[PDB]
Amino acid sequence: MQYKLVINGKTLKGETTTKAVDAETAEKAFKQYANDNGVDGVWTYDDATKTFTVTE
Numbered sequence: 001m002q003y004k005l006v007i008n009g010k011t012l013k014g015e016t017t018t019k020a021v022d023a024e025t026a027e028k029a030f031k032q033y034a035n036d037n038g039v040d041g042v043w044t045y046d047d048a049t050k051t052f053t054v055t056e
Contacts, residue, residue, distance in 0.1 A: 001019070001020065001021075001022075001026075001050060002017055002018075002019055002050070003017065003018055003019070003020060003023070003026040003030070003050050003051070003052065004016075004017050004049075004050065004051045004052070005017070005018070005030045005033070005051075005052050005053075005054065006051060006052070006053045006054070007034075007039060007054055008041075008053065008054065008055040008056070009039050009041065009054070009055075009056045010056045012037060012038075012039060016033070018030065018033075023045065023047070023050075026052070027045070027052065030052055030054075034054055039054055039056060040056065041054040041055045041056040042054070042055055
């Protein structure tokens with residue numbers, strides 16, 4: 001499944017995507033991505049749209 005990450009950061013804003021077999025695998029990839037880019041926010045996940053959102 002294609003999962004989407006919506007980033008609403010202080011300085012970095014946009015969207016990116018990743019492919020994974022399940023949501024927990026996608027979450028790990030996105031949490032690594034966020035850490036690598038210095039984003040420290042709160043997360044939500046909407047199973048209906050397969051979209052994660054992170055806000056600083």
